[PDB]
Amino acid sequence: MRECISVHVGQAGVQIGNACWELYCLEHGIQPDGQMPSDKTIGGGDDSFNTFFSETGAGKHVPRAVFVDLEPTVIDEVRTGTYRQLFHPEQLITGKEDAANNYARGHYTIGKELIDLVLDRIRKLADQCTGLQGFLIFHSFGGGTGSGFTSLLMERLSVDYGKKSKLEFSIYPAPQVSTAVVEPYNSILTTHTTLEHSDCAFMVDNEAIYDICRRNLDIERPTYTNLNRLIGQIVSSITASLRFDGALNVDLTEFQTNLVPYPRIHFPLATYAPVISAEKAYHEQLSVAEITNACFEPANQMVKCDPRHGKYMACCLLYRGDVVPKDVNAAIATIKTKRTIQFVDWCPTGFKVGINYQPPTVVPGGDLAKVQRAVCMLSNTTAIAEAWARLDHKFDLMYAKRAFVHWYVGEGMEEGEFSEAREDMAALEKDYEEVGMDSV
Amino acid sequence: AVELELEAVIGFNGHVPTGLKCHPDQEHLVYPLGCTILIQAINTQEQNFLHGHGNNVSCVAISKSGLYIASGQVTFMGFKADIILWDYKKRELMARLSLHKGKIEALAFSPNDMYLVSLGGPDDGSVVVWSIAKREAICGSPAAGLNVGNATTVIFSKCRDEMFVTAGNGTIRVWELDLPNRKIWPTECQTGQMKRIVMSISMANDDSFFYLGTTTGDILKMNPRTKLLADTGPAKDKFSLGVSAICCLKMGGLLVGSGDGLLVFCKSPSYKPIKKIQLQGGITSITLRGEGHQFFVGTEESHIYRVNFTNFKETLITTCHFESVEDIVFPFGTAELFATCAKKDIRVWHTLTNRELLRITVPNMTCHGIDFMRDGKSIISAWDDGRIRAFAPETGRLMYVINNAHRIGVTAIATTSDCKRVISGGGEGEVRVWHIGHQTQKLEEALKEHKSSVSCIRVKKSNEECVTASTDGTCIIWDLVRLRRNQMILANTLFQCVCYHPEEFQIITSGTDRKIAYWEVFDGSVIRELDGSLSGAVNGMDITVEGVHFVTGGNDHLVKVWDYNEGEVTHVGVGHSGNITRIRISPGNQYIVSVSADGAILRWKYPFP
Amino acid sequence: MREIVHLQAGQCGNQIGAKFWEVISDEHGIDPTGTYHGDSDLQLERINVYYNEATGGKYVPRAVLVDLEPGTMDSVRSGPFGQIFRPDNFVFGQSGAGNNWAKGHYTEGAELVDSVLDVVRKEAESCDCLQGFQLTHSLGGGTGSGMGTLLISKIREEYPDRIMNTFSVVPSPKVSDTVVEPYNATLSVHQLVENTDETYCIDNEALYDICFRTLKLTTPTYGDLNHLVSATMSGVTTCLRFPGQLNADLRKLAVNMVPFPRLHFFMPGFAPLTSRGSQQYRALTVPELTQQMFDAKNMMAACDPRHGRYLTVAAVFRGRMSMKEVDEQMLNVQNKNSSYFVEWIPNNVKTAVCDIPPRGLKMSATFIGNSTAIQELFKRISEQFTAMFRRKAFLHWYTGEGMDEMEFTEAESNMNDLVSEYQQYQD
Amino acid sequence: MREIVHLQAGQCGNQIGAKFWEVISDEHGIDPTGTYHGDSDLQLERINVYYNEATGGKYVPRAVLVDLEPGTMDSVRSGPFGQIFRPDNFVFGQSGAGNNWAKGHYTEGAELVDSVLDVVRKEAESCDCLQGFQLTHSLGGGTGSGMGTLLISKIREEYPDRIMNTFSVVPSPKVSDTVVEPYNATLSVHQLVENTDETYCIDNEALYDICFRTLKLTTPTYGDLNHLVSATMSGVTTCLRFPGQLNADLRKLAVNMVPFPRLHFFMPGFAPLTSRGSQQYRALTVPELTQQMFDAKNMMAACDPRHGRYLTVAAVFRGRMSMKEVDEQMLNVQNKNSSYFVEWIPNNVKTAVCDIPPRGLKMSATFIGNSTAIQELFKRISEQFTAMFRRKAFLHWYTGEGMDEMEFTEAESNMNDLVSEYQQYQD
Amino acid sequence: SSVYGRRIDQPVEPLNRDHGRAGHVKADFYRKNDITSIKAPGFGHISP
Ligand SMILES: Nc1nc2c(ncn2[C@@H]2O[C@H](COP(=O)(O)OP(=O)(O)OP(=O)(O)O)[C@@H](O)[C@H]2O)c(=O)[nH]1
């Protein structure tokens, strides 16, 4: 078992981390006080916590995480919440002034006031780690520090820690619905650092998650908490083999070389298959085929980009629970023989299957009914290029009139970087349409 | 399969610390004898058996109520030991409580019975807290620091929250129990610069001070309420090999033992002897018969004593082999004498009242063989050195020794009825034939066929040939008169016992395949093949002198009554826990006696004339 | 005398070798605690060939357990027969191979190769004459493929006259469990064709059919998918630890299965495989024993023997058998089926019975064939390499640890040159 | 009737030496008080070598215990085996040798010499025919570096023909605990070359390494480090205290291992070192004691023995062993490693067997050798000297109790000549 | 934001703590400190 810290930045990132660390401590057994009710002697010591927890001696297990947000409202609610003894006060770094939905005062002006304290605190976790695999950094592409401060982290963690698998769990803004007005700007100005020192940029937009909660999970009027519980179960298959045993154990370094074909192409999707509510959970049988089929379906995806109008290039399929290998490779066979699901010619192979032995633990009060055989898919398709293209249209419209710029340039940022992020996105879109032609 | 009767038991495993105990009803003793724990009655021959356990038990822990008795066994490293609770009133398993890997060193109960501390393992030492109510675990922590070593002792107090451990590396730590958070909190006791090695704990009756017995020969008294030392031991004239047993009285006194047997009653401030009496063997257990007037002392060379406090006069009530016992043989004619034969010792015993009359010790040496000459004038012995020592029946002097008899030990031995020839086996697989003159003990022939090792010699009723079981799968009927062979009986089992059926025409063979088989003395063919015991192998047999019953015991720790003509089974067992090595029909056909891998001499009332 | 230490490497190799050290341990008779409580002395006398010795009758496996991540070391030790392996042979690392062939060979395996070679160089000098080394691995993954073949080349230089046989798990046809599997297999047999004597090729999809269409097991696990390989691995070295009428050790197979020195990729097969319901409805006599092992269904390598010639032939029979039938049936396989046998070797039979059967089954065999249907296994890894090499794919995680694009052509040249040899003789 | 006087000086010397008195009291059967309770009479037959007699048959060690502080004096006295020691042999100062070769040799160390040497005269003249003197002194620091070497010079002038063994903890380059340990070693070497017949150097770097990769201990403490040192110390004197098939006293492995007149810096090592975790999964035989000896791991003098050639090595064995396989393995290590031994000596290995082994095991051995690589243990301190002597660093302390810098230059020159003479006899 | 962790004291599932990742190679290979191998069996060395 090895370790990985999780740097949550943004109001979004720490509220995703609120649902994540609730699930994390439940899987192992850590109570909100921070203590495990059974001791390491009793149990034939189970060091499954080590990937996300660290013992102090009195049984006080510790979240290997650093909550950061530059505005003090969403971080003080976890120093006053039920999980206030679990976290460490030095881990919960906060600031005074808002980023105010502005890239410039996330990276250049306000972000420099706390870039020293976080990089010291990453060092504190990294020193006591012995097998630190990856940085699981949670943020959203459509706000302040989640667009800002995370870019200054990505540059600093690469100079300091180098090759340590800088993963990135991220929240893209949606095609139609949006909770900001300046959102196109800070969503393409920060993707410089995303196509730079970050090796696997997982993608979720808020809009697709609402549709899953309505159709499959059968709740109308969903709030932001149910949207974050889905993200927590996404990690818990990505970090399941690092914490629990399985048939095909799959490491965090395994994920990259099994999903990134080219150094520029490093943007996967995420899909949880058996995500149904309890009343329609007596109803479906849910063996193995219907959930292998589920991730491969449009109205189960977690990003508003249809894989049918695109070609797959890499797809690791991670399974948990009571999954039998013959049931997988038959389900692999039956879905590799469907015309609408297209794989590019330079991937004759197909899928990376990962089998785990731990069924997903249900959050009490959560929506998701228990499933004894679950799937968390991490795809990689050319169809993500339409998700980059819809904000490209939206950015090009409100930049040609030079709107909402005097907030940006008058905060420590040069005008030239705006045009640099413009040409940078054209290059990545040209790369994705290039990597998906069939050479013949 | 009618049970015979189990009368009388000799045996005690004194090598465990804190062994022999007397429950507060003051009428029965409790002591461990293998992977079983006995209950011998005070003033009554009545004795019962606590079954269970796989390998040899290392711990006993009886309650202040007497209602609960616990124990703990050793196992192979990597495997999990089993702490077995019991009820003294009904003697039946009520918990298995398996957490500690490796083995156990010590158990202690809570004052009023609701927790058990069972510190276990030189490989996996970690103190745990049990529940006597839920039969389930509560707390858990490493029992020693990373700078210090490992702990082998536990004790409770007069309040059920304290639990105290010492060490062979100095981990004097007074813990405190914290049920709501389910954790324990240690506190190392400062003792100055006195790092010592200590192996025994006792506390006062009013929870004042706990008392230590170190290897240096020093009684360490320390405070559990200020976590500090109070008084060191004897300044001069310190004890011997370290104090291995301490038992604090209801007074301000303490019965301190030693590794030699110097049981001393001393007071607190000087720790100077008041009344000294020397015991044989290193003192491993000092119990109290409740009030403390009759304290029973157990020793590692297993001898249970009986000392009255007001005169310090002893009475040896139990005497045992302290090591593995092999070969029981009876003198010709009479059936009231044994030959209980073990490492470091050769003993004889009176059958009716178990009481030894001669002990023959050859230093740190092992005797795999014993035999009685027909004239009753020499106890022939086969020692691990390679020397055939022949001691005298009375006194115990060495009449003669045959130096360099066999190379790798002399294992199996047998005399002849003419009292002139001693047929000798060997661990190199050699059968030697010696001549016993009045002044010389020469060699006549060296018959060498067996490759591995010889296991059992048997001689017929009027001497012309002998059978020699061997560990390589061969049993040869050597011709004794013309110094040759006669047979090449062969099988795929490591033979461990062979016997001559009276009216000699066929021999019965045993071994590892549990395929008890009659074999003929002519043409050496298979006659029957009985199935021995379904569990392990068969070490030992004896056919009666009327040829109607042959008794059987083996690794299956269990005496088995088998009649001859039909292969039916009149099985009994429920005997002793420890691998039965040899067994012998009494000459008068009145008892059957088996030895075991742990020192234990069992007698059963032989049926079937 | 004759000695085989067992170099299990990788995740797959440690799992199969765990299953392998169980089927030896209930054949020679070993408890989880390494002690003998077996039955016969016709079972111990040659326990040397796989097991070392400690005090008190404590036979210890002669296996060097190596895997770059420390996770699979935990699974072997926590397994049922995991309390037997000596705790000095466990040579693990810190960072896993990532199923990256040079992450296993040139940059983290390079600091573990000098440590695992020391342990092999201790269990090789306690041998009067060591025959050779068996290395259980998988060509699909990383440290099994990359580090594993690094051990092969180093060993072949250190001990150059010993039987280097490898029990390999070569990629499956349709089932794919790694998208990095085409490159890992290609680089491995570039180092395996020249430095190994007997490459036994075990697929996965082939065994998937055997546990369904022959054995009828609805939900089979990897343990049952390694028991068939372990039964084969016991089968090869059977006239080497137990007595036989006509004996055959590893070299006697090797001299009789490799006509031409490059050509050594073989096909395992276990004959007596009965479904549980259909077990009482089948006589256990040698005519069905020879049929089933030559049948294309019980063929644990996904290369149909009807799609090619079948150069050299094994039947390492086990049990008390009459020698006429194993000369009659093997002749009947040849003469009647005079098409799927090469005309340029007169008689292709290496029948060799043992006396001691496997536990239970009173009859057995071990099918080891050098067919030229092997090329179908190495054409498919040659068409998906070239598809992935055409437009440079996953190579930024291949050249970063330090390699060249030159070695990919040299590795792929050794592929089609190997296939051309099996196509030269296919006619 | 060949006795040894065991001197010990410094905190390190008093700690290792007290650990030595525990392992002799176990092999010779002495309880913590002092009474003989060992079983074998082969122990009481030579109780004179390291012990004396007193009233009531309480055997007392023949040791003089000296330190300039009563800090480790009270630790030895208040220990597990701390009452055996004579209560006047605890002879000590009170001031303190704050690390300085001056503060043991040219000041406060030099007033206690006239008292400790009276005890040495009293003990050496209670022997019938004393064999020699052994001293445990840390080469880096105060009492050991200084006063200990001062004691060596006085005893050598008084008793010139009796041998002088020194077990010395030379300062390691990586594990460092004092900053002036380069200064103390260079000044201590000069009075260890002309006044010592055998210098066993035992640095702390290898001792930590053996307790991590051989003993496999998570957290070694100072107690078990000296137990490895005490095992070697009770490996060279064993044929002075127990019978044997081929006996060898402390002079026989001096006449057969000191080639040239200075040439006497040796490297210790123990044969049967195993973890408790391994222990059972391993046999204890003569051809595996010799592998555990002739390596890097068990060489507690941390210095690569493959980067130099052994002049003369001996191996004193203890157990019930046969004289062929012992001599055969000593022959084999010379043939298969013919480049690791010099050629101008025909046989480089000396053999000794002592029947009675240490308590516990049934077999052990000791490995001391005159490797020419020991200059590497002496280059580093010279490098740590010249890069500390160039700018007169930390020297004003040294020239305060009376010491010219000319003594410093000649000590470095003598130690460089020590490296020279080992460098000449490479080939 | 308090909805994260209200029903935590009403568990719906007893946790199946069987398929874990309990470390055995780091805890059964490496002993703490005794050097037992060249130590006597001593007091209380009952063997199976
Ligand atoms: N997944 C997820 N995304 C959220 C959540 N809440 C907000 N977001 C997304 O985050 C974006 C804005 O949040 P942040 O980036 O964290 O804004 P911020 O860090 O507070 O910026 P400043 O207040 O200026 O410092 C919105 O556009 C949402 O799309 C949430 O609970 N879960």
Ligand SMILES: Nc1nc2c(ncn2[C@@H]2O[C@H](COP(=O)(O)OP(=O)(O)O)[C@@H](O)[C@H]2O)c(=O)[nH]1
């Ligand atoms: N037969 C068998 N195959 C296995 C087993 N475990 C994994 N595999 C196969 O090995 C391939 C991947 O090998 P991998 O585990 O990555 O090897 P690694 O490089 O050591 O990690 C997959 O295609 C699996 O089918 C097993 O226990 N038995």
Ligand SMILES: Nc1nc2c(ncn2[C@@H]2O[C@H](COP(=O)(O)OP(=O)(O)O)[C@@H](O)[C@H]2O)c(=O)[nH]1
């Ligand atoms: N192996 C070992 N080394 C020790 C011990 N005690 C001290 N040392 C070493 O001795 C060195 C310091 O010696 P020092 O106490 O200054 O010698 P002194 O001034 O003569 O008393 C340190 O570098 C330690 O590594 C011990 O118990 N065992």
Ligand SMILES: [Mg+2]
């Ligand atoms: Mg905010």
